[PDB]
Amino acid sequence: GEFADKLNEQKIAQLEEVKQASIKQIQDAIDMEKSQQALVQKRHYLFDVQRNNIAMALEVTYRER
């Protein structure tokens, strides 16, 4: 009788870790993708701020002259 219960509870326990892993991994495929998307567009802006800053600073300078 017990033969089943231990095995069964074993068998469930498994798919319980299986569903778990599975969520946790796909959440990670997810994070990775956000990391990427960010490094994409995202990062250029830093340099864009910088280039913009220059452009302005020359204009102000020209005008001031």
Binding site: D28, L39, I54
Partner: protein
């Protein structure tokens, strides 16, 4: 003709626009693409692959 002298001199005096000797950023950018861009993205993709491969197995 001080004024005449000046009006003339004023006009057709061309004030220099400042050299943009400052876009070394373009460079510091292209650099951080060696860095951020390729390197990270390449590894992230590879990790996403294995994860996917790891979900593969688990489907069976």
């Amino acid at each position: 003709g001080l004024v005449d002298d000046f009006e003339k001199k004023f006009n057709a005096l061309k004030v220099p626009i400042p050299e943009d000797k400052y876009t070394a950023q373009v460079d510091a950018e292209e650099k951080e693409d060696v860095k951020s861009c390729a390197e990270f993205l390449t590894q992230s993709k590879t990790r996403i692959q294995e994860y996917e491969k790891e979900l593969e197995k688990m489907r069976n």
